[PDB]
Protein backbone atom coordinates (compact mmCIF):
# COMPACT_ATOMS: atom_id res chain seq x y z
CA UNK A 1 0.00 0.00 0.00
CA UNK A 2 1.21 3.35 -1.03
CA UNK A 3 1.79 6.09 1.93
CA UNK A 4 0.82 9.60 0.83
CA UNK A 5 4.10 10.78 3.21
CA UNK A 6 5.16 14.06 4.04
CA UNK A 7 8.16 16.28 3.85
CA UNK A 8 8.33 16.21 7.38
CA UNK A 9 8.43 12.16 7.48
CA UNK A 10 12.25 12.84 6.83
CA UNK A 11 14.95 13.96 8.13
CA UNK A 12 16.44 17.83 6.85
CA UNK A 13 16.82 15.61 -8.17
CA UNK A 14 17.30 12.46 -6.13
CA UNK A 15 18.56 12.20 -2.76
CA UNK A 16 19.08 9.51 0.23
CA UNK A 17 16.50 9.97 2.31
CA UNK A 18 15.90 8.65 5.75
CA UNK A 19 12.50 8.45 7.34
CA UNK A 20 11.98 9.33 10.23
CA UNK A 21 10.07 6.09 11.46
CA UNK A 22 11.37 3.48 8.66
CA UNK A 23 14.34 4.20 7.39
CA UNK A 24 16.35 4.00 4.43
CA UNK A 25 14.69 5.21 1.31
CA UNK A 26 15.42 6.89 -2.52
CA UNK A 27 13.12 9.87 -3.25
CA UNK A 28 13.02 11.69 -6.29
CA UNK A 29 11.18 15.27 -5.98
CA UNK A 30 9.44 15.09 -9.21
CA UNK A 31 7.89 19.15 -9.04
CA UNK A 32 8.50 22.20 -7.33
CA UNK A 33 6.67 25.61 -7.95
CA UNK A 34 2.89 26.66 -9.00
CA UNK A 35 0.08 24.88 -7.11
CA UNK A 36 -1.80 22.66 -9.78
CA UNK A 37 -3.91 21.14 -7.22
CA UNK A 38 -5.84 19.85 -9.98
CA UNK A 39 -3.92 16.77 -10.84
CA UNK A 40 -3.63 15.74 -7.32
CA UNK A 41 -6.18 12.31 -7.06
CA UNK A 42 -4.64 11.22 -10.47
CA UNK A 43 -1.07 11.68 -9.66
CA UNK A 44 -2.46 9.51 -6.10
CA UNK A 45 -4.40 7.10 -8.00
CA UNK A 46 -1.18 6.57 -11.00
CA UNK A 47 0.54 5.88 -8.10
CA UNK A 48 -1.73 3.61 -6.68
CA UNK A 49 -2.02 1.85 -9.97
CA UNK A 50 2.16 1.97 -10.41
CA UNK A 51 2.31 0.59 -6.53
CA UNK A 52 -0.51 -2.57 -7.22
CA UNK A 53 2.21 -4.23 -9.46
CA UNK A 54 3.49 -6.52 -6.93
CA UNK A 55 6.47 -9.30 -7.22
CA UNK A 56 9.14 -10.81 -5.86
CA UNK A 57 11.83 -8.39 -8.74
CA UNK A 58 9.44 -5.36 -9.43
CA UNK A 59 10.37 -2.56 -7.42
CA UNK A 60 8.15 -1.60 -4.14
CA UNK A 61 6.90 2.18 -4.94
CA UNK A 62 7.02 2.86 -0.69
CA UNK A 63 5.12 6.34 -0.54
CA UNK A 64 4.41 9.76 -2.40
CA UNK A 65 5.00 13.57 -1.17
CA UNK A 66 1.81 15.70 -2.92
CA UNK A 67 2.13 19.08 -0.89
CA UNK A 68 1.15 22.72 -2.10
CA UNK A 69 3.93 23.10 -4.96
CA UNK A 70 6.13 19.55 -4.07
CA UNK A 71 5.03 16.22 -5.43
CA UNK A 72 7.66 13.36 -4.69
CA UNK A 73 8.10 9.92 -5.28
CA UNK A 74 9.09 7.48 -2.81
CA UNK A 75 11.20 4.05 -3.84
CA UNK A 76 12.86 1.50 -1.82
CA UNK A 77 16.54 1.51 -1.43
CA UNK A 78 18.29 -0.93 -3.26
CA UNK A 79 21.71 -1.60 -2.30
CA UNK A 80 23.81 -2.47 -4.89
CA UNK A 81 23.14 0.07 -7.07
CA UNK A 82 21.41 -0.94 -10.87
CA UNK A 83 22.72 -4.24 -12.80
CA UNK A 84 25.54 -2.15 -14.81
CA UNK A 85 27.00 -0.91 -11.29
CA UNK A 86 27.42 -4.72 -10.01
CA UNK A 87 28.84 -5.46 -13.41
CA UNK A 88 31.98 -3.22 -13.58
CA UNK A 89 32.56 -3.69 -9.75
CA UNK A 90 36.30 -4.69 -8.88
CA UNK A 91 34.82 -8.37 -7.18
CA UNK A 92 33.70 -10.36 -10.20
CA UNK A 93 30.10 -12.12 -10.22
CA UNK A 94 30.45 -15.61 -10.63
CA UNK A 95 28.74 -17.45 -13.60
CA UNK A 96 25.43 -18.82 -11.33
CA UNK A 97 24.87 -15.54 -10.02
CA UNK A 98 24.39 -14.17 -13.31
CA UNK A 99 22.58 -16.93 -14.42
CA UNK A 100 20.31 -16.14 -11.50
CA UNK A 101 20.07 -12.58 -12.37
CA UNK A 102 18.86 -13.91 -15.85
CA UNK A 103 16.20 -16.07 -14.63
CA UNK A 104 15.19 -12.88 -11.88
CA UNK A 105 15.08 -10.77 -14.83
CA UNK A 106 12.82 -13.20 -17.46
CA UNK A 107 10.00 -13.29 -14.02
CA UNK A 108 9.97 -9.64 -13.39
CA UNK A 109 9.40 -9.26 -17.51
CA UNK A 110 7.16 -11.91 -17.20
CA UNK A 111 4.82 -10.72 -14.46
CA UNK A 112 4.77 -7.16 -16.04
CA UNK A 113 3.87 -8.38 -19.40
CA UNK A 114 1.32 -10.78 -17.49
CA UNK A 115 -0.43 -7.61 -16.16
CA UNK A 116 -0.60 -5.65 -19.49
CA UNK A 117 2.55 -3.47 -18.62
CA UNK A 118 5.06 -2.99 -21.54
CA UNK A 119 7.90 -1.69 -20.10
CA UNK A 120 9.61 0.24 -22.74
CA UNK A 121 12.83 1.20 -20.93
CA UNK A 122 14.16 -2.09 -20.19
CA UNK A 123 18.11 -1.57 -19.94
CA UNK A 124 20.49 -2.07 -16.62
CA UNK A 125 19.85 0.95 -15.00
CA UNK A 126 16.31 -0.29 -14.57
CA UNK A 127 17.65 -3.10 -13.33
CA UNK A 128 18.19 -2.72 -9.53
CA UNK A 129 20.16 -4.91 -7.25
CA UNK A 130 20.07 -5.91 -3.34
CA UNK A 131 22.71 -6.76 -1.13
CA UNK A 132 22.10 -10.43 -1.81
CA UNK A 133 22.37 -9.83 -5.32
CA UNK A 134 18.53 -10.55 -6.24
CA UNK A 135 17.19 -7.99 -8.60
CA UNK A 136 13.73 -6.10 -9.12
CA UNK A 137 13.01 -4.22 -12.26
CA UNK A 138 12.41 -0.36 -11.81
CA UNK A 139 11.12 2.54 -13.87
CA UNK A 140 13.30 5.19 -13.13
CA UNK A 141 12.45 7.50 -16.49
CA UNK A 142 8.69 7.18 -15.12
CA UNK A 143 7.78 5.77 -18.59
CA UNK A 144 4.81 3.97 -17.33
CA UNK A 145 3.88 6.99 -14.91
CA UNK A 146 2.63 8.97 -17.59
CA UNK A 147 1.30 11.46 -15.41
CA UNK A 148 4.27 11.81 -12.91
CA UNK A 149 6.14 11.70 -16.12
CA UNK A 150 3.89 14.99 -17.52
CA UNK A 151 4.10 16.55 -13.66
CA UNK A 152 7.92 15.89 -14.61
CA UNK A 153 7.88 18.00 -18.06
CA UNK A 154 5.86 21.03 -16.44
CA UNK A 155 7.19 24.09 -18.38
CA UNK A 156 6.61 26.13 -14.45
CA UNK A 157 8.64 23.50 -12.80
CA UNK A 158 12.12 24.18 -11.63
CA UNK A 159 18.08 8.51 -23.47
CA UNK A 160 20.23 5.90 -24.29
CA UNK A 161 19.36 3.97 -27.59
CA UNK A 162 21.57 0.38 -26.85
CA UNK A 163 17.97 -0.70 -26.03
CA UNK A 164 16.07 0.27 -28.09
CA UNK A 165 14.67 -2.32 -30.99
CA UNK A 166 15.54 -1.33 -33.93
CA UNK A 167 11.84 -0.94 -35.16
CA UNK A 168 11.73 2.61 -32.65
CA UNK A 169 14.77 3.96 -34.25
CA UNK A 170 14.18 7.13 -36.26
CA UNK A 171 10.28 6.04 -35.51
CA UNK A 172 8.37 7.48 -32.64
CA UNK A 173 5.09 6.70 -34.31
CA UNK A 174 5.67 2.56 -33.83
CA UNK A 175 4.45 1.31 -31.01
CA UNK A 176 5.95 -0.54 -28.63
CA UNK A 177 4.97 -4.14 -28.11
CA UNK A 178 6.15 -7.30 -25.37
CA UNK A 179 8.69 -7.66 -28.33
CA UNK A 180 10.25 -4.35 -27.99
CA UNK A 181 11.10 -5.38 -24.42
CA UNK A 182 12.51 -8.70 -25.62
CA UNK A 183 14.66 -6.99 -27.55
CA UNK A 184 16.46 -5.07 -24.78
CA UNK A 185 16.45 -8.25 -22.75
CA UNK A 186 18.74 -9.32 -25.72
CA UNK A 187 21.27 -6.50 -25.08
CA UNK A 188 21.04 -7.05 -21.20
CA UNK A 189 22.12 -10.50 -21.35
CA UNK A 190 25.03 -9.64 -24.01
CA UNK A 191 25.63 -6.45 -21.40
CA UNK A 192 25.76 -8.87 -18.53
CA UNK A 193 28.73 -11.28 -19.83
CA UNK A 194 30.71 -8.51 -21.78
CA UNK A 195 30.56 -6.36 -18.15
CA UNK A 196 30.18 -3.41 -20.36
CA UNK A 197 27.93 -1.64 -22.67
CA UNK A 198 27.34 -2.91 -26.23
CA UNK A 199 28.97 -0.40 -29.50
CA UNK A 200 32.11 1.48 -27.58
CA UNK A 201 33.56 1.70 -30.97
CA UNK A 202 30.38 3.75 -32.53
CA UNK A 203 31.01 7.25 -32.66
CA UNK A 204 27.70 9.19 -33.77
CA UNK A 205 24.40 8.88 -32.96
CA UNK A 206 23.37 8.55 -36.86
CA UNK A 207 25.42 5.99 -37.21
CA UNK A 208 24.61 3.64 -34.86
CA UNK A 209 20.70 4.45 -35.34
CA UNK A 210 21.69 3.45 -39.33
CA UNK A 211 23.48 0.41 -38.51
CA UNK A 212 21.60 -1.01 -36.02
CA UNK A 213 18.14 -0.87 -37.84
CA UNK A 214 20.63 -2.15 -40.97
CA UNK A 215 21.07 -5.30 -38.47
CA UNK A 216 24.66 -4.98 -36.51
CA UNK A 217 23.94 -6.10 -33.17
CA UNK A 218 26.74 -6.26 -30.41
CA UNK A 219 30.11 -7.90 -30.91
CA UNK A 220 29.62 -11.20 -29.25
CA UNK A 221 33.58 -11.89 -30.03
CA UNK A 222 33.94 -8.73 -27.72
CA UNK A 223 32.64 -11.28 -24.48
CA UNK A 224 36.38 -12.20 -23.19
CA UNK A 225 35.09 -14.33 -20.15
CA UNK A 226 33.11 -17.45 -20.59
CA UNK A 227 29.26 -17.39 -21.94
CA UNK A 228 27.07 -20.17 -22.46
CA UNK A 229 26.90 -21.01 -26.00
CA UNK A 230 23.19 -21.68 -25.30
CA UNK A 231 23.34 -17.99 -23.85
CA UNK A 232 24.61 -16.77 -26.85
CA UNK A 233 21.81 -18.33 -28.91
CA UNK A 234 19.18 -16.86 -26.60
CA UNK A 235 20.57 -13.37 -26.92
CA UNK A 236 20.98 -13.73 -31.26
CA UNK A 237 16.87 -15.22 -31.20
CA UNK A 238 15.79 -12.24 -28.85
CA UNK A 239 17.35 -9.50 -30.76
CA UNK A 240 15.92 -11.00 -34.41
CA UNK A 241 15.47 -7.78 -36.59
CA UNK A 242 11.17 -9.41 -37.22
CA UNK A 243 9.77 -8.63 -33.43
CA UNK A 244 7.28 -11.25 -34.32
CA UNK A 245 9.76 -13.97 -34.57
CA UNK A 246 11.52 -12.95 -31.37
CA UNK A 247 9.87 -15.40 -28.62
CA UNK A 248 8.25 -14.58 -25.32
CA UNK A 249 9.39 -13.95 -21.83
CA UNK A 250 7.30 -17.39 -20.82
CA UNK A 251 8.59 -19.02 -23.91
CA UNK A 252 12.15 -18.02 -22.83
CA UNK A 253 11.48 -19.10 -19.27
CA UNK A 254 10.36 -22.27 -20.18
CA UNK A 255 13.66 -22.78 -22.22
CA UNK A 256 16.23 -20.92 -19.61
CA UNK A 257 15.03 -22.27 -16.55
CA UNK A 258 15.80 -25.46 -16.88
CA UNK A 259 19.20 -24.55 -18.34
CA UNK A 260 19.53 -22.55 -15.42
CA UNK A 261 18.79 -25.52 -12.66
CA UNK A 262 21.44 -28.09 -14.78
CA UNK A 263 23.98 -26.17 -15.46
CA UNK A 264 24.74 -22.72 -13.86
CA UNK A 265 23.26 -22.77 -10.54
C1 LIG B 1 17.49 7.65 -10.48
O1 LIG B 1 16.19 8.02 -10.96
C2 LIG B 1 15.13 7.79 -10.12
C3 LIG B 1 13.82 8.00 -10.56
C4 LIG B 1 12.77 7.76 -9.68
C5 LIG B 1 13.07 7.31 -8.39
C6 LIG B 1 14.40 7.12 -8.03
N1 LIG B 1 15.36 7.35 -8.90
N2 LIG B 1 12.03 7.07 -7.47
C7 LIG B 1 12.03 7.68 -6.13
C8 LIG B 1 11.02 6.26 -7.84
O2 LIG B 1 10.11 6.05 -7.04
C9 LIG B 1 11.04 5.64 -9.22
N3 LIG B 1 10.08 4.54 -9.17
C10 LIG B 1 10.18 3.51 -10.03
O3 LIG B 1 11.05 3.47 -10.88
C11 LIG B 1 9.21 2.42 -9.90
N4 LIG B 1 8.24 2.35 -8.97
C12 LIG B 1 7.60 1.23 -9.20
N5 LIG B 1 8.20 0.63 -10.25
N6 LIG B 1 9.16 1.36 -10.67
C13 LIG B 1 7.56 -0.64 -10.58
C14 LIG B 1 7.48 -0.74 -12.09
C15 LIG B 1 8.49 -1.40 -12.78
C16 LIG B 1 8.44 -1.48 -14.16
C17 LIG B 1 7.37 -0.93 -14.86
C18 LIG B 1 6.37 -0.26 -14.18
C19 LIG B 1 6.43 -0.17 -12.79
C20 LIG B 1 6.18 -0.59 -9.87
C21 LIG B 1 6.46 0.37 -8.68
C22 LIG B 1 10.64 6.61 -10.32
C23 LIG B 1 11.33 7.97 -10.08
Same mark, same amino acid.
Given at each position: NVIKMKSSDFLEKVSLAFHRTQGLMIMKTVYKGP =?? #? &??NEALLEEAKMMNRLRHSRVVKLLGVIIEEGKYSLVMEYMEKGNLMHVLKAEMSTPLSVKGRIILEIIEGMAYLHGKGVIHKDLKPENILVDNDFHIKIADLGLASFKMWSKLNNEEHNEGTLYYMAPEHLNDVNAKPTEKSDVYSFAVVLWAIFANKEPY &? =?? #?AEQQLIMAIKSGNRPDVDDITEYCPREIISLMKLCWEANPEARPTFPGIEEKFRPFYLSQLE
Open positions: =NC #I &EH &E =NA #I
